[PDB]
Amino acid sequence: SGFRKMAFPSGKVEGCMVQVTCGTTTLNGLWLDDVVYCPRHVICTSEDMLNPNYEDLLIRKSNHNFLVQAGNVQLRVIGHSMQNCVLKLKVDTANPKTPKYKFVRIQPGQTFSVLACYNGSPSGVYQCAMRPNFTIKGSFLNGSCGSVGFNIDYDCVSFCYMHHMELPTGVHAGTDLEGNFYGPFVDRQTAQAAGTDTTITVNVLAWLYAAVINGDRWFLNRFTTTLNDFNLVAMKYNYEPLTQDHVDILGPLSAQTGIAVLDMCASLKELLQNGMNGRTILGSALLEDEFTPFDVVRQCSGVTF
Amino acid sequence: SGFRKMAFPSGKVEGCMVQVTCGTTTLNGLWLDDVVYCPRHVIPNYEDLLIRKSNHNFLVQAGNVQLRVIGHSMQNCVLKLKVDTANPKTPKYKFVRIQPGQTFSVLACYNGSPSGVYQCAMRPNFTIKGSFLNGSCGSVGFNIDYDCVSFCYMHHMELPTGVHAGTDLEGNFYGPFVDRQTAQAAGTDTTITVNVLAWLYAAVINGDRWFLNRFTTTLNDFNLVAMKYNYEPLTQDHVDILGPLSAQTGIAVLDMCASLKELLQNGMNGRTILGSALLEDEFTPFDVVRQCSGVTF
Ligand SMILES: COC1(CS(=O)(=O)N2Cc3ccc(Cl)cc3[C@H](C(=O)Nc3cncc4ccccc34)C2)CC1
Ligand SMILES: COC1(CS(=O)(=O)N2Cc3ccc(Cl)cc3[C@H](C(=O)Nc3cncc4ccccc34)C2)CC1
Ligand SMILES: [Cl-]
């Protein structure tokens, strides 16, 4: 019993965190085999950030301009290249602590763990979701750039995010490990703002199924809904449209609890209309959207209370 | 910017998790140097049950390697299995006993394999609101101070309300519990007042000031009000501990108490604080300072 926002154990990622310094800028890098991956803005000044020409800034650098530190050991950079918004620093030593890993690009609604780092040293781990507007609501201070997001289903680390910047609203933007930004963001000090955010509907439904598994059914009703009538109502509360894929994905949780997806959609519609009336669901007074159907099946028991 | 429920990095603890099997029971153990620590219920008159066991009855598995048990002893509700191999991954560590209100990270494990990490607090009723399934017994709670792991909790059981109970690493239970199948229940819980105040200071630091007002209060008037909402009494020590956050934000502790008093009497009125519609009590003053400063390990 219980339902917590649970992160993956971070040990496999901790052994990959290094510090990268170029001139006055210091940030974090991910050391996998003989390559250190880091945000390309490590080559920038604060002035450069308005309209940086990364190709022009990079051609002026040599390998020995990049200082890489793994613990108390200085790594020697023997090559460098840029792939999209990430810099790949070839080093003389392969990381003996390199785990089994993949680089995966995720979709909005997907969750992952963030190992927040400063000066190549891990400070904390927390669970996050890629918002529908492609930002993340993280907890990051200056010096956190290069911190990574990941999942560890089985013993393989799937790296899905590298931190690049904080937007004016306090939310965060970054790239996959191939350097492609999530969303329409640029690694430039440009007037850019997160688009209007929405609630991840499939995740709220998954969390309502988690509540039923743990023994709570106060929020259910005798009604059902068509998928179209549910979406017409959901859009009015800034909820993401629910697709047939989302309905298919919720199939296993529907079969375990005995509550059809469209019947759980009817309960959500009523919760949006009435609120909670002094009650909570899994210790929360708001509808939680940062647990996916996969996270619920992973954390919850296979036997409904 | 941002404020999340953050756990310590778990790597130093992951390298200590092992699987312990005795008969039909399988649970987790903590391997430090040449000793594996686990709940004694893996084997009730525990001394009588233990005398009938030999070293070879305890099967200990670290990853894909079988460790050989060469001795065993009981300390309170914890079994200490002496093994033939010292853990080469043993970190710098201490065994510490925490107080209610203090927080810690839990590395939840099944079959000696870590599955997740989450942050939680020792409730004033000595239970923890964890997330554990069958097979999680022996999972540990800890804090990291510089490079030293301070082990503070070992999981033993789930109570009927779904909350959890366990011991320190010396085998002493947190709370009036016993390690047997009998009628036991968590007492009525209260809210950790000093932690709610710390979280209100975290909200101010993150730019949320709607709850701030011109009023102040006395410690006595605040405590009279707090007792009526099932909040723990606020002591002069709690006021002293909140000193740094008070100086940083410019809001006196009894000034923040007047805001909390108004939040208890009026509610949030459709508003949230740090993305929450409830008053959060699982961040200590030190957790707030640490997350709003970037301390590393
Ligand atoms: C909205 O302005 C802020 C960021 S900044 O200092 O202006 N900054 C400009 C900028 C622009 C583009 C890119 Cl790719 C990186 C950056 C940098 C940046 O985003 N750094 C930070 C990342 N993650 C959390 C940070 C919390 C605080 C400070 C800085 C952080 C540096 C919050 C102050
Ligand atoms: C009231 O909870 C139940 C627990 S039990 O299976 O009866 N149980 C009896 C018992 C007695 C003493 C001691 Cl020290 C440990 C235990 C065990 C226990 O507590 N295990 C569990 C711990 N943490 C989460 C668990 C979630 C599910 C199951 C079991 C868990 C085994 C479901 C009925
Ligand atoms: Cl995805």
UniProtKB/Swiss-Prot annotation, chain A:
Outcome after substituting N142A: Does not affect ability to cleave and inactivate human TRMT1
Crosslink site: Glycyl lysine isopeptide (Lys-Gly) (interchain with G-Cter in ubiquitin): K5, K90
Effect of P132H: In strain: Omicron/BA.1, Omicron/BA.2, Omicron/BA.2.12.1, Omicron/BA.2.75, Omicron/BA.4, Omicron/BA.5, Omicron/BQ.1.1, Omicron/XBB.1.5, Omicron/EG.5.1
Cytoplasmic topological domain residue ranges: 1-305
Notes on activation and inhibition: Inhibited by pyridone-containing alpha-ketoamides compounds 13a and 13b. In turn, alpha-ketoamide 13b (tert-butyl (1-((S)-1-(((S)-4-(benzylamino)-3,4-dioxo-1-((S)-2-oxopyrrolidin-3-yl)butan-2-yl)amino)-3-cyclopropyl-1-oxopropan-2-yl)-2-oxo-1,2-dihydropyridin-3-yl)carbamate) inhibits SARS-CoV-2 replication in human lung cells. Inhibited ex vivo by michael acceptor inhibitor N3. Inhibited ex vivo by compound 11a and 11b.
Active site per the UniProt annotation: H41, C145
Localization, UniProt: Host cytoplasm; Host Golgi apparatus; Host nucleus
Catalytic activities: TSAVLQ-|-SGFRK-NH2 and SGVTFQ-|-GKFKK the two peptides corresponding to the two self-cleavage sites of the SARS 3C-like proteinase are the two most reactive peptide substrates. The enzyme exhibits a strong preference for substrates containing Gln at P1 position and Leu at P2 position
Residue ranges of every copy of the Peptidase C30 domain listed in the record: 1-305
Subunit-structure text: 3CL-PRO exists as monomer and homodimer. Only the homodimer shows catalytic activity. Interacts with host FBXO22; this interaction promotes the proteasomal degradation of nsp5.
Chain's role: Cleaves the C-terminus of replicase polyprotein at 11 sites. Recognizes substrates containing the core sequence [ILMVF]-Q-|-[SGACN]. Cleaves and inactivates human TRMT1, preventing tRNA guanine(26)-dimethylation of tRNAs. May cleave human NLRP1 in lung epithelial cells, thereby activating the NLRP1 inflammasome pathway. May cleave human GSDMD, triggering alternative GSDME-mediated epithelial cell death upon activation of the NLRP1 inflammasome, which may enhance the release interleukins 1B, 6, 16 and 18. Also able to bind an ADP-ribose-1''-phosphate (ADRP).
Official protein name in the record: 3C-like proteinase nsp5
Organism whose genome encodes this protein: Severe acute respiratory syndrome coronavirus 2 (2019-nCoV)
Gene: rep
